[PDB]
Amino acid sequence: SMSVKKPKRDDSKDLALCSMILTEMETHEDAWPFLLPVNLKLVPGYKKVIKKPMDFSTIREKLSSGQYPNLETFALDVRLVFDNCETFNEDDSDIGRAGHNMRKYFEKKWTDTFK
Structure with a gap:
């Protein structure tokens, strides 16, 4: 509350560490369905059904341009994929x-890096 704070958890390495995780996800042999955005012109049903499309290249661009306020918003987009x-x-x-x-691969790296 006001003037009452839990001890400061060190978050200064979070950006680097999320980038490393994301690199590992990008280079996994089973990443191919997730590397790029689904082509909404060429895949019937996708646009209507999937209200918030997400892919690794979009997460990489958001990461690189300061559009994740904290490591939890990064994990939310990975899980969305x-x-x-x-x-x-x-x-x-x-x-x-x-x-x-x-x-599975993601959730283990997430636990091992941060929990």
């Missing part, structure tokens, strides 16, 4: 499996 993927893709598809794999 995988939540979108589950909305649009069957679990038993190459893309559906890719999204589960990447979500």
Whole structure:
């Protein structure tokens, strides 16, 4: 509350560390469905169904231009990529499996780096 603060957690390395995570996600062999924005002209249903499209290149540009206020808003966009993927893709598809794999990979790096 006013003039009453928990001890200051060191956040000065968060930008660097999110960038490293994102690099690891970008270079994973199962990243291919997520590297670029879904082409809304060429994929029927995507535009109407997925209210907030997100992809790794869009997260990279937001990261690089100071558009994440803190590490939690970064994690929310990463999770959005995988939540979108589950909305649009069957679990038993190459893309559906890719999204589960990447979500797992992300959540471990997130825990190991920050928790």
